[PDB]
Amino acid sequence: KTKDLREKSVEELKALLDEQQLNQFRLRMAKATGQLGKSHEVQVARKTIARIKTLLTEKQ
Amino acid sequence: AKIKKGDQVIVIAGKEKGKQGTVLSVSEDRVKVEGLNLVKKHQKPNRVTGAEGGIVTQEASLHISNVAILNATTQKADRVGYQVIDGVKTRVYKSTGESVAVA
Amino acid sequence: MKRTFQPSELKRKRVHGFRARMATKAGRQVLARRRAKGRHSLTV
Amino acid sequence: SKVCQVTGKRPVVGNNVSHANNKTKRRFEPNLHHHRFWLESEKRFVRLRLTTKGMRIIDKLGIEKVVADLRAQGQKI
Amino acid sequence: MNNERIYQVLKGPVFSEKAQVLGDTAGVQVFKVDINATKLEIKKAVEKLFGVEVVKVNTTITKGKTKRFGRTLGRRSDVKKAYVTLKAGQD
RNA sequence: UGAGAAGCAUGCUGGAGGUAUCAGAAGUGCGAAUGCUGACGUGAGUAACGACAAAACGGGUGAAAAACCCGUUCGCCGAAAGACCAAGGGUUCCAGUCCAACGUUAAUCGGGGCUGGGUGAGUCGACCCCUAAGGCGAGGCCGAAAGGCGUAGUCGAUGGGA
RNA sequence: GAACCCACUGUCGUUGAAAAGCCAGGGGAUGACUUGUGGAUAGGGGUGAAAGGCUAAUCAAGCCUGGUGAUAGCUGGUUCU
RNA sequence: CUCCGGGGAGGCGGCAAAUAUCCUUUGAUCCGGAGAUGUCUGAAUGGGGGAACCCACCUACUUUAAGGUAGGUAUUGCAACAUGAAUACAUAGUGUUGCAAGGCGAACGAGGGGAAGUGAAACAUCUCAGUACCCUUAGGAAAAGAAAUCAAUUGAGAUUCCCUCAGUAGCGGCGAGCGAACGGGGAUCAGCCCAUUAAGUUAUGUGUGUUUUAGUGGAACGCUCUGGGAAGUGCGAACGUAGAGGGUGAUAUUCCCGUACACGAAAGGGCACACAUAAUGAUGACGAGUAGGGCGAGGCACGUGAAACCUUGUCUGAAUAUGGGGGGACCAUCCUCCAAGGCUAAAUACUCCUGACUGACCGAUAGUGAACCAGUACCGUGAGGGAAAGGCGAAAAGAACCCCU
Numbered sequence A: 001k002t003k004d005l006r007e008k009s010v011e012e013l014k015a016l017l018d019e020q021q022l023n024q025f026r027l028r029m030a031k032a033t034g035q036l037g038k039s040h041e042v043q044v045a046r047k048t049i050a051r052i053k054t055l056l057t058e059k060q
Numbered sequence B: 001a002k003i004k005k006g007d008q009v010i011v012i013a014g015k016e017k018g019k020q021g022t023v024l025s026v027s028e029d030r031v032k033v034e035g036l037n038l039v040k041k042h043q044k045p046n047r048v049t050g051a052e053g054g055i056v057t058q059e060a061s062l063h064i065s066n067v068a069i070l071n072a073t074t075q076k077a078d079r080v081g082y083q084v085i086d087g088v089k090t091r092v093y094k095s096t097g098e099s100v101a102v103a
Numbered sequence C: 001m002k003r004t005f006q007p008s009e010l011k012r013k014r015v016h017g018f019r020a021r022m023a024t025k026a027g028r029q030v031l032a033r034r035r036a037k038g039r040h041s042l043t044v
Numbered sequence D: 001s002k003v004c005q006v007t008g009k010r011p012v013v014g015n016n017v018s019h020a021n022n023k024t025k026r027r028f029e030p031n032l033h034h035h036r037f038w039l040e041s042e043k044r045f046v047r048l049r050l051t052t053k054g055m056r057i058i059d060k061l062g063i064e065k066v067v068a069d070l071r072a073q074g075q076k077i
Numbered sequence E: 001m002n003n004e005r006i007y008q009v010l011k012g013p014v015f016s017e018k019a020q021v022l023g024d025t026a027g028v029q030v031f032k033v034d035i036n037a038t039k040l041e042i043k044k045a046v047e048k049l050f051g052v053e054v055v056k057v058n059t060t061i062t063k064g065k066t067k068r069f070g071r072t073l074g075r076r077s078d079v080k081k082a083y084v085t086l087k088a089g090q091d
Numbered sequence F: 001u002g003a004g005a006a007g008c009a010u011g012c013u014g015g016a017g018g019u020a021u022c023a024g025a026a027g028u029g030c031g032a033a034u035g036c037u038g039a040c041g042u043g044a045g046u047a048a049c050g051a052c053a054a055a056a057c058g059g060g061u062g063a064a065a066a067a068c069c070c071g072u073u074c075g076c077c078g079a080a081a082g083a084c085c086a087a088g089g090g091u092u093c094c095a096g097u098c099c100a101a102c103g104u105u106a107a108u109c110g111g112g113g114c115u116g117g118g119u120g121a122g123u124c125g126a127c128c129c130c131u132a133a134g135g136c137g138a139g140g141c142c143g144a145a146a147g148g149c150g151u152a153g154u155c156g157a158u159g160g161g162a
Numbered sequence G: 001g002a003a004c005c006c007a008c009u010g011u012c013g014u015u016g017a018a019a020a021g022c023c024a025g026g027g028g029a030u031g032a033c034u035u036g037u038g039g040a041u042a043g044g045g046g047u048g049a050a051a052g053g054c055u056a057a058u059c060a061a062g063c064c065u066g067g068u069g070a071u072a073g074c075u076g077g078u079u080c081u
Numbered sequence H: 001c002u003c004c005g006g007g008g009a010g011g012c013g014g015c016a017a018a019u020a021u022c023c024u025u026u027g028a029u030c031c032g033g034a035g036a037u038g039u040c041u042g043a044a045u046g047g048g049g050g051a052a053c054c055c056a057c058c059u060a061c062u063u064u065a066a067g068g069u070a071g072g073u074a075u076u077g078c079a080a081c082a083u084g085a086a087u088a089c090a091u092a093g094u095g096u097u098g099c100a101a102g103g104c105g106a107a108c109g110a111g112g113g114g115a116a117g118u119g120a121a122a123c124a125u126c127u128c129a130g131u132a133c134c135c136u137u138a139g140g141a142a143a144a145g146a147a148a149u150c151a152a153u154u155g156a157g158a159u160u161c162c163c164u165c166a167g168u169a170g171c172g173g174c175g176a177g178c179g180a181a182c183g184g185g186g187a188u189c190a191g192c193c194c195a196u197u198a199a200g201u202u203a204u205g206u207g208u209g210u211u212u213u214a215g216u217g218g219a220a221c222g223c224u225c226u227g228g229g230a231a232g233u234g235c236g237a238a239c240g241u242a243g244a245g246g247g248u249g250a251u252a253u254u255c256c257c258g259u260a261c262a263c264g265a266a267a268g269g270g271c272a273c274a275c276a277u278a279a280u281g282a283u284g285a286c287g288a289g290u291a292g293g294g295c296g297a298g299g300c301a302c303g304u305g306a307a308a309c310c311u312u313g314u315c316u317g318a319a320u321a322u323g324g325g326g327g328g329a330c331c332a333u334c335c336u337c338c339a340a341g342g343c344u345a346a347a348u349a350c351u352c353c354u355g356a357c358u359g360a361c362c363g364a365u366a367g368u369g370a371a372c373c374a375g376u377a378c379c380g381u382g383a384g385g386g387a388a389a390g391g392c393g394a395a396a397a398g399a400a401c402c403c404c405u
């Protein structure tokens, strides 16, 4: 996924960061309510946010 | 001198010495071979999940130094070497130099 | 009967506390000795 | 502290020695005191804490030379 | 306020008899929130992420327990709870 | 078996090391030091079970009830043996469940073990503004060094301020 | 004369309920009074209506760590044949 | 988390199993190198404070409400600039910007202060001892160092360290004790400058060499007996530039990991040499309040002694190369050196650390206080004091099921 994020530009990356953070909140809420059986998506989103931040500081 | 998850091996030491089978897993210095070195586990019944217990038979791991790959041509124990054929490293039989047969 | 220890957190901190030890060179030597000995707790 | 600005003299340690040769620690102190000197090149009085040997050196070399020398060593006169 | 803090403020719901009764009868939602969250922060977060109207927010902090698990003494973290009163009939 | 410190053989237990001869080096031999550490005896199933306000019975649960629960009686405190706040303590608070250890007895009970809950403020308190005793203290004065004192200031409630 | 602050007599207790108490009596109780909170004085120093009293259950020189394995013409002990 | 390199069948750290979701030959986990992020306290530095907390100000951008993002705001010293009293010029004072410092940490170095127990069979001179301790402050070492030095056939030739001289000469309530030098043998060797200013040292840049931080290949054993298990018994083979070591169900050169040996680097670091540019050496140009003297002390093996020589608290005070210092009171003669200005590597001292190797060192009351969740539990207001506690089995195969309770 790192390559896919890398071809994108700064504006698209900053938008993707907001979408991923909102998705992280939704996933946390679902897990807390107990309606989330598959649990690896929280780790995937948590790593995706870090990758986006790394690429952002690399490009700036 | 590697032993991999799909090899055909023969046991050279222990109570199973002289028998052969397919290795099921390699972890650290221990190897499990299907159908060999069986132990009887007295499994207690599980209150939460049901699945009442009983006496079950399952494989137990042997030390990696207690098995050797089986040479298919000669049906004897053998050691493993490495040769760089073309550009790739390949395991070979030390007795005859032929490439190890993938199972 | 009245015994010797009459607890008070403010007095404890003002007499034996971290800043009280830092205020003098002898207190800093006390902290150095306790760090060298490897105490899990430096001060009260 | 008791340091002469001109010579750098300071109290030193020694012994009182009695007739029975008992030895006790003591200090020798400089003949220190304050004195105002007229600096003509600056039209003002400069107050120094110095010894009588400092006054003798000032008599020998002139106040201007001594003041310039002390300034050259980082003394704020 | 930024969306980062907005998405970080709320941690999860509270499931207990008191929380259930408050939700059933009084139109009050009980949340676990970040230990450093303020009442205004919680109000804004709830309003943005659930599209409701908040009347007032009440917060409380419960200190963590210290228990002897096995041979070692451990301590749980402090938990801050937020009582959020909704307007009229919402949620 | 030898004069002795000791040696040799072998039954049982034990389950992986031991070591002739001749030389070489010593943390080389314990009963005492009111010796040091751990374990265990005698006293002895002896003294004692912590305010002489006081208990009795019916039913319940339970393996087991003088001590727990419910009920009917009796008694004690009532300027504290009742109800609160500060200090101090820190989950001892509430519910379910368990009884090995803790409770000077037993315990189904508990401030005990385990699991889950519980502390909602513009008006209460703290924080905040203000200062006392006192502390620290830019420059400064003094002192072998460390440092002592102190000006402008800055802190400091046990007091003033919705 | 109660609260509060003391501590004159006696029995009990003395491996105590308590490393200074209980009980029955006793003294002061608007004053040189009692008391909370927060401060100051540090060891040949402090403080003392003065007993060498008190200075964290320790006082004719507090406690801790170093000099230090102080010195002891003294006492004890010193291991197989 | 990203990039580069290595590696090639498994993995999601340990106590600590088990389960679920999963990841991975489109290269996972893991190893090495380089980057990104890096909350709060603590020199803590925006102010304060009972450490991990309370309260702020200014500027720019952004939001519409009671905010967000980024930056700046400590003190002291130095420099530049501006401003500026008594007081006329000035000066003190004040402000801004830039640069630097503070704190921690083993031992060794240098410097400022400096005991007593003890011994003398008592004790004061003396000893202990410039030791313990307190304080300031460097470097990889530091300090010292190129003769106003020794020697005494007129010879040696800077400093530092070791052996000897020698427990000698001496000092000493001539007690207890303290204790040299000359000369000789070694280690290491090196000199260069004071105003157009030297050797050297430190930074930076480039080049060459070397080393270091992952890794790859790596020989050769069968049968038989005892046995739960063979590496052990018996018989016969093979390798050796590899018979170091560890593991494997008992004791293995040939089962496994390795070992000898042969290779290996995208990238980064250390050291050596050479060149180039800065700086520094270097406010110093042959040394006057100096040498010497009186008084009081200190250091010299040397305690006032016949006491030379060095340092100076106090009072004084030259000559200045036809000059001056020393040769242990002092004089003469001879010999020797040139103070009152500097820089300088090696031989020497040490171990908080990193890697490799070793032990007639210990083996759980031993060895670190600590083999184990130890400076912990526990004790104390505090400084501080300070334990006990290792072993199922080769493999959990850790005892399904029945019975008493």
Ligand SMILES: NCCC[C@H](N)CC(=O)NCCC[C@H](N)CC(=O)NCCC[C@H](N)CC(=O)N[C@@H]1[C@H](O)[C@@H](OC(N)=O)[C@@H](CO)O[C@H]1NC1=N[C@@H]2C(=O)NC[C@@H](O)[C@H]2N1
Pocket (backbone or CB within 6 Å): H396, H399
């Ligand atoms: N005919 C009569 C029949 C009667 C009938 N049957 C009924 C009856 O009457 N039955 C009686 C039952 C007997 C008894 N009650 C049962 C019992 O007691 N169970 C105890 C069960 C829990 C037990 N406490 C767990 C435990 O201690 N774990 C230890 C422990 O973590 C730790 O040890 C230390 N040092 O602390 C560690 C050391 O590294 O080892 C662990 N363990 C390990 N095992 C592993 C291994 O082997 N290899 C690999 C690694 O996994 C190893 N670690």
